[PDB]
Structure formats: structure tokens, C-alpha cells
Design a protein around this ligand. Structure first.
Ligand code: HEM
Ligand SMILES: *[C@@H]1O[C@H](CO)[C@@H](O[C@@H]2O[C@H](CO)[C@@H](O[C@@H]3O[C@H](CO)[C@@H](O)[C@H](O)[C@@H]3O)[C@H](O)[C@H]2NC(C)=O)[C@H](O)[C@H]1NC(C)=O
Ligand SMILES: *[C@@H]1O[C@H](CO)[C@@H](O[C@@H]2O[C@H](CO)[C@@H](O[C@H]3O[C@H](CO)[C@@H](O)[C@H](O)[C@@H]3O)[C@H](O)[C@H]2NC(C)=O)[C@H](O)[C@H]1NC(C)=O
Ligand SMILES: *[C@@H]1O[C@H](CO)[C@@H](O[C@@H]2O[C@H](CO)[C@@H](O[C@H]3O[C@H](CO)[C@@H](O)[C@H](O)[C@@H]3O)[C@H](O)[C@H]2NC(C)=O)[C@H](O)[C@H]1NC(C)=O
Ligand SMILES: *[C@@H]1O[C@H](CO)[C@@H](O[C@H]2O[C@H](CO)[C@@H](O)[C@H](O)[C@H]2NC(C)=O)[C@H](O)[C@H]1NC(C)=O
Ligand SMILES: [Ca+2]
Length: 595
């Protein structure tokens, strides 16, 4: 007897239904189906979940339970044998700036977050999990395979805690397990403003009727603002350097300080808000704080949607853009906003675009200081390098002048992420993002590689030879078969990323399809999509079609030399122009007048 729906977390909201602005939680976007796309609800399922016991257990959880007749290789084993590489020479992307990779994480953070199980309120089950590699309940450690170097130095496994699921955080069983999406599915700047009420209201500066976002009161960037500091027992950022004592930042999204270039882009967007809110007071001295806040917030979301859809997607996707994301024909309330569960893994193609180093550049876009270039892995949860070493201006230049890493079937994920990842409660710079991606692929009950090739109307290889043909790599196909034994068993993250990139894109056909369908949905299914008639006026959409990431930098930094097209590889000074040459955002259409 099928069910209409599940009822634990949700004190329900009324909906204004006259309302102009999006809610903070995403609720009320779809009038006939309120909760669609709202934070803290189940990630949507495009295909039924596939677990080892049909309900919630991990393929690979029980030694004896095979997937289609074969054991399901250890995540860290797939990582070692396939994902890793030694030589960082030549892996750079000749036609994608480092911003390409960065916007990707930004957009991704705007769309989805599946935390680990809230059941962690003064327990040792985390330390027991950590210490003796005892699998049980939500502790699902990543076991090291034999001959794994980390055995000589780290122990027998790597922490890992299953994702939050719906209708509790403790006991459940009776139907298939569904993981939670803690942020709104809409492209709406929830990473800047937040997805709950605590949080939004508290990022805000309410002492002054100007609708500013609260800023750091304890540090300045040559007169420019920094996000406020955070508040936890264990701040990660402090932990990585106990002498410096610099806290992580407080943003609408939780992960803001995971890495220094992500905190940088966050710092960037928070300035755009206050800049808009300030130019909005100058233009409208009567508008109160909430009106300034909400209309700045409106505009910021529109900027994110445009840079993403106009500049970003066309070059992830390439020749498949026009197959999945056609010209926008208007708000369609029949579409499902919801970020699917598989998309949260598909969008992880970004992990293969992160290079091994990050640079600080000075005004002439030459090395800044004596330790200009830094090992990626020393910048996890690193805020001190920003506050007490130059601000964001040198880092933003590197985002423009340096390049992204290029996905390469023989060099997938840099060791800075594959062996040196820092996670916020554990002590070492010794984790593996690729192994975690795979373990999480199964924690979430993802169907295999062929289930998705089928979903996308693509062939489903059954033999080495077939897979060779699809991967266009004999040796990669070989290692996969040796590891998984049937194309059927290949985890979607790695199978999806094993495919050669499409014409003029950076993902293969399978991911082009998975990503292409989702972005089409979050656009068409948004009542507040910026280009939907009503949302913005006649002259309002005209001023907005002029925004660019180059202008965002120009207005929120003291940089004055930027590329016109920030996402392609840009070389200084030839590919760089002066800020005066770049179109500004004309706020004149926001003018309401009265008597
Ligand atoms: C450090 C990390 C990064 C940079 C140095 C980084 C970068 C990205 C980019 C460039 C992405 C897409 C364009 C992207 C996507 C998603 N990530 Fe990733 N990422 C770093 C680290 C992490 C870690 C840690 C996680 C959590 C892993 C887990 O399963 O526990 C992570 C996840 C994701 C993810 C799913 C988010 C969610 O929906 O839960 C992406 C879409 N990344 N990252
Ligand atoms: C919320 O908004 C208020 C008002 O904008 C913020 O206070 C204002 O902050 C500015 C810059 O931080 C201050 O300007 C200058 O202060 C320095 C040193 O304190 C001084 O040398 C100058 O005289 C100059 O005024 C200013 O004091 C202050 N303005 C007012 C009217 O109070 C406040 O910081 C914001 N709160 C948060 C949490 O962001
Ligand atoms: C480096 O990458 C550049 C971006 O991927 C690429 O330039 C792009 O060329 C394509 C091919 O005509 C154009 O495609 C876009 O055309 C217009 C946009 O002007 C849109 O209406 C279409 O939907 C489509 O997205 C672009 O004009 C152009 N990209 C940009 C941002 O201008 C270069 O060819 C690459 N450089 C090298 C040396 O290979
Ligand atoms: C933890 O953070 C420390 C900062 O709180 C950092 O120490 C600082 O490192 C800088 C280099 O970035 C040193 O400054 C350099 O340049 C200045 C120029 O004025 C010179 O005075 C110095 O001789 C030096 O060449 C600072 O000396 C130093 N500051 C302090 C208070 O020690 C640590 O390196 C960080 N440790 C880790 C593990 O990240
Ligand atoms: C709004 O969105 C829906 C998607 O849910 C679109 O739907 C359709 O396209 C076909 C028209 O050629 C219809 O025959 C199908 O019923 C439908 N397909 C799917 C997957 O829904 C369509 O653009 C809009 N729907 C309506 C009713 O206008
Ligand atoms: Ca969102």
C-alpha cells in the first residue's frame, strides 16, 4: 500500500501567496506543491534506490552480499588503482581559468548539501568509529586495501559517517532510505543568505535600517569587508594553526571555509550584497532595511543564475548544452525543482578540476611575496592566510590568471585531495575525497553505471571490449573490470568521470545528460527565475544582462585589470583590460518615486 508522504521534521509554514520575494527555506515557490525544492527535505529519486538489502544497507556493507554476483571493491582500492597519479606536470587546462573550477563549487553549494547524521550530541561513537574501525549503524569506515601506503602510517581505515536521512536521525526501516538536502534546490544565493531562519536573520545586520549583511568587526581588507567569524567548540580553521587563532567564516552555507578560494568567492558575494544595498539607499532613501536586504538579495540571486547559465554551463556542457538546456520559454509549474540524489554525485566532476597549488599574485600579476604559491592541502579550512597575509585580492588574481586542472583519465584527482584532505574533526591532513565520494555513492543507494547509461539512452557495455570502446581507453577499462567485474557494478561517480569529454565541454556524455537535465529543471521550475516575466521589469532585465564576473571583481576589490571572459584561460597582460572598459550594472530601473 503506497504512501502519499512522511511526517516528522516540518513544523509547516503558511504561504503569503502575494509574495514578491522567495522564502529563505525555499518553501512556497511552487504554489500547488509548497515544499517542492525547499531545504531539509528528501533529495529527489530519478531511479529507485539500490541498497544491499533493498532498504538502507550499503552495497559493500556485508562481506557476503554481492552486487549482481560480484563483490564490490573497496572505495580506497578504486581510488589507489584508478584515481591517483604522481606527476602534476602538464595536467593544467589550457582554456579554463581557476575560476572555472571555483564557480563550480559555489553553484554546487547553492544547490545541495547532505550532512552526516545529526546523531552526534556528546557521544564516543564517533571516537570509537575513528579508533577501532568498527562498522556499525551510521559508522561506515573506509577500509584500507592491502599494500596501501596509509597502513604504514595512519591505521586501518578512514572515518566516514552515513548521510542524514529523513524521518529521524536514529531508528527507521520500513521503506527505502532517503537522504536529506539541507539547502534550497533553487539557484537563489542560499549560500550567501542561508537556508534556515536562525541563520539568515543572524548573518544580517539589524542594528541599522540599511539591510546590510553583518560584516567582520575584527578585520579589514584594505578598507574592504570580510565575512564574520564563526562560533564552534572546535573551529577547523583555528585548529590548522593554533598560533594564529583565526576562526572560520560565517556564511549562509556551512562549508564556506573548506578551502581558501571558496571563502574568497564567498567574501566576494557578501560585498556585492552590501554594495547593492548601499547604492540602493542612495537611490531610495525611504526604503527600509528589509526592503533593501530583500531587493539586494533578489539581485544577487539573479547574478548567480546569469553567470551560471550564460557563462558557466555552456562550457561545462559544450555540444550537449542545446540538447538539454534550450532557450528559456518561461516558468513551468509542472517541473520538479528538486535536486536529485544522483546529481549531488554528478556535480562532483569538479574534484578532478582542482589543481595541486594555489597562488597569490600582485598588481602586475607576478608572484606575491616569497611564499606566493602554496600546496592546496595547506589551505583546507585556512582563513589565517587571508586575514593575516594579504587579503583576497592576491587570491582573486590567481583565480583569474592561473588555470584549472583538466580531467585526465590517467590523472584524475590530485593527491592534495586524494591523500591529504583535512576533515573538520579529525586530526590529520590524510583523507581521500575520491574514496569518500565512492563510499558516499553507496551510502546513498546509487544505481550502477549502466542503470544510468540506460536512463540517459546510451549503450550499456557488458564486456571489457565494450567498455574499452565507450571509455576509449584500453588500460582504464581493464582496471575497472578487474575491480568491478561487470560494467553494471561501476559506481556512478567514477564511471561517469571515466568517459572522455564532449565537444567543447568538460564532462562526458553521461554526465552531460545527468547535469543537463537537473539544471534545465531548476531553471524551468523556478517561479522566481530572473527572466520570468513579472519578477524583474522592462529596463531591469536589460541592466542585469550586462553583469559579468569581471565586473563583480572590479566593484568588490581594488583590482583593475581583468579578462572580459573570466572563465577561459587568461594571460596577463594581453588577455587583460582595464575595469573602465567593462559594463557596469545599471541600478537606475529600481527607482520608485511617489506624490
Ligand atoms: C576541498 C574541496 C574542494 C576544493 C579544493 C572541492 C571542490 C569542489 C568543486 C570544484 C565542485 C564542483 C564543481 C565540488 C562539488 C561537490 N563537492 Fe566538493 N570539494 C572539496 C571537498 C568536498 C568534500 C569534503 C565533500 C563532502 C564529501 C562527502 O561525501 O562527505 C564535497 C562534496 C561535494 C558535493 C556533494 C555536496 C552535497 O550535496 O552533499 C559536490 C556537488 N566536496 N567540490
Ligand atoms: C551594521 O551597520 C553599521 C552602520 O553601517 C556598522 O557601523 C558602522 O561601521 C563603520 C565601519 O565599520 C564605522 O565607520 C568608521 O569607524 C571608524 C572606526 O570605528 C572611525 O574611524 C570612523 O569615524 C568611521 O565612522 C562606523 O563607526 C559605523 N557607523 C555607524 C553610523 O555606526 C556596523 O559595524 C554594522 N554591524 C555589523 C555587525 O556589521
Ligand atoms: C576557449 O573556450 C572558449 C569558450 O568555451 C571558446 O570560445 C567560444 O566559441 C563558441 C563557438 O562559436 C561560442 O559559442 C557560444 O556562442 C554564443 C556566445 O557568443 C551563444 O549564443 C551560444 O549559445 C554559445 O554558447 C562563443 O562565442 C565562445 N565563448 C565565449 C564565452 O565567447 C574558444 O574557442 C576556446 N579557445 C581556444 C583557443 O580553443
Ligand atoms: C600560523 O600563523 C602564523 C601567523 O599568525 C604564521 O607565522 C607568521 O608567518 C609569517 C609569514 O607568512 C611571518 O612573516 C614573515 O614576513 C614578516 C614581514 O613583516 C617578517 O616579520 C617575518 O620575519 C617573516 O619573514 C611572521 O613572522 C609569522 N608571524 C608570527 C606572529 O609568528 C605561521 O607560519 C603559521 N603556521 C602554520 C603552521 O601555518
Ligand atoms: C511543462 O513542463 C512539462 C514537464 O513536466 C513539459 O511536458 C511535456 O512534453 C510533452 C509535449 O510534447 C507532453 O506530451 C508530456 O506530457 C510532457 N513531458 C513530461 C516529461 O512532462 C511541458 O513543457 C509543460 N507541461 C505542460 C502541461 O504544459
Ligand atoms: Ca539554493
Amino acid at each position: 500500500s503506497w504512501e502519499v508522504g512522511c511526517g516528522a521534521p516540518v513544523p509547516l509554514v503558511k504561504c503569503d501567496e502575494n509574495s514578491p520575494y522567495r522564502t529563505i527555506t525555499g518553501d512556497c515557490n511552487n504554489r500547488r506543491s509548497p515544499a517542492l525544492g525547499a531545504a531539509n527535505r528528501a533529495l529527489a529519486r530519478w531511479l529507485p534506490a539500490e541498497y544491499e538489502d533493498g532498504l538502507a544497507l550499503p552495497f559493500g556493507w556485508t562481506q557476503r552480499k554481492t552486487r549482481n554476483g560480484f563483490r564490490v571493491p573497496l572505495a580506497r582500492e578504486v581510488s589507489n588503482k584508478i584515481v591517483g597519479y604522481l606527476d602534476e606536470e602538464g595536467v593544467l587546462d589550457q582554456n579554463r581559468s581557476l575560476l572555472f573550477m571555483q564557480w563550480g563549487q559555489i553553484v554546487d553549494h547553492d544547490l545541495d548539501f547532505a550532512p552526516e547524521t545529526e546523531l552526534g550530541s556528546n557521544e564516543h561513537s564517533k571516537t570509537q568509529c575513528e579508533e577501532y574501525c568498527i562498522q556499525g549503524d551510521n559508522c561506515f569506515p573506509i577500509m584500507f586495501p592491502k599494500n596501501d601506503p596509509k597502513l604504514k602510517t595512519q591505521g586501518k581505515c578512514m572515518p566516514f559517517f552515513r548521510a542524514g536521512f529523513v524521518c529521524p536521525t536514529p531508528p527507521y526501516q520500513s521503506l527505502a532510505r532517503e537522504q536529506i538536502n539541507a539547502v534550497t534546490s533553487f539557484l537563489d544565493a542560499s549560500l550567501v543568505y542561508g537556508s534556515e531562519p536562525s541563520l539568515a536573520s543572524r548573518l544580517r545586520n539589524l542594528s541599522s535600517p540599511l539591510g546590510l549583511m553583518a560584516v567582520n568587526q575584527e578585520a579589514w581588507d584594505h578598507g574592504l569587508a570580510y565575512l564574520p567569524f564563526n562560533n564552534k567548540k572546535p573551529s577547523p580553521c583555528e585548529f590548522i594553526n593554533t598560533t594564529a587563532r583565526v576562526p572560520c567564516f560565517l556564511a549562509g552555507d556551512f562549508r564556506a571555509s573548506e578551502q581558501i578560494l571558496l571563502a574568497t568567492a564567498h567574501t566576494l558575494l557578501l560585498r556585492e550584497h552590501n554594495r547593492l544595498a548601499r547604492e540602493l539607499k542612495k537611490l531610495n532613501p525611504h526604503w527600509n532595511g528589509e526592503k533593501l536586504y530583500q531587493e539586494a538579495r533578489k539581485i544577487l540571486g539573479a547574478f548567480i543564475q546569469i553567470i551560471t547559465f550564460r557563462d558557466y554551463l555552456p562550457i561545462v556542457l559544450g555540444s550537449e548544452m542545446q540538447k538539454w538546456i534550450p532557450p528559456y520559454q518561461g516558468y513551468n509549474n509542472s517541473v520538479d525543482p528538486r535536486i536529485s540524489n544522483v546529481f549531488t554525485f554528478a556535480f562532483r566532476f569538479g574534484h578532478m578540476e582542482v589543481p595541486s597549488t594555489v597562488s597569490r599574485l600582485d598588481e602586475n600579476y607576478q608572484p606575491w611575496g616569497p611564499e606566493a604559491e602554496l600546496p592546496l592541502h595547506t589551505l583546507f579550512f585556512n582563513t589565517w592566510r587571508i586575514i593575516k597575509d594579504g587579503g583576497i585580492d592576491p587570491l582573486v588574481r590567481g583565480l583569474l590568471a592561473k588555470k584549472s586542472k583538466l580531467m585526465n583519465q590517467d590523472k584524475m584527482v590530485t593527491s592534495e585531495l586524494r591523500n591529504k584532505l583535512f576533515q573538520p574533526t579529525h586530526k590529520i591532513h590524510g583523507f581521500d575525497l575520491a574514496a569518500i565520494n565512492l563510499q558516499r555513492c553507496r551510502d546513498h543507494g546509487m544505481p550502477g553505471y549502466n542503470s544510468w547509461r540506460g536512463f540517459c539512452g546510451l549503450s550499456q557495455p557488458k564486456t571489457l571490449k565494450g567498455l574499452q570502446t565507450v571509455l576509449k581507453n584500453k588500460i582504464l577499462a581493464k582496471k575497472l573490470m578487474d575491480l568491478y567485474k561487470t560494467p553494471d557494478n561501476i559506481d556512478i561517480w567514477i564511471g561517469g568521470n571515466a568517459e572522455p569529454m564532449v565537444e567543447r565541454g568538460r564532462v562526458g556524455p553521461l554526465l552531460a545528460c545527468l547535469l543537463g537535465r537537473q539544471f534545465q529543471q531548476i531553471r524551468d521550475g523556478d517561479r522566481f527565475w530572473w527572466e520570468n516575466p513579472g519578477v524583474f521589469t522592462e529596463k531591469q532585465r536589460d541592466s542585469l544582462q550586462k553583469v559579468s564576473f569581471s565586473r563583480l571583481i572590479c566593484d568588490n576589490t581594488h583590482i583593475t585589470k581583468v579578462p572580459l571572459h573570466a572563465f577561459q584561460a587568461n594571460n596577463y597582460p594581453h588577455d587583460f583590460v582595464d575595469c573602465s572598459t567593462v559594463d557596469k550594472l545599471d541600478l537606475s530601473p529600481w527607482a520608485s518615486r511617489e506624490n
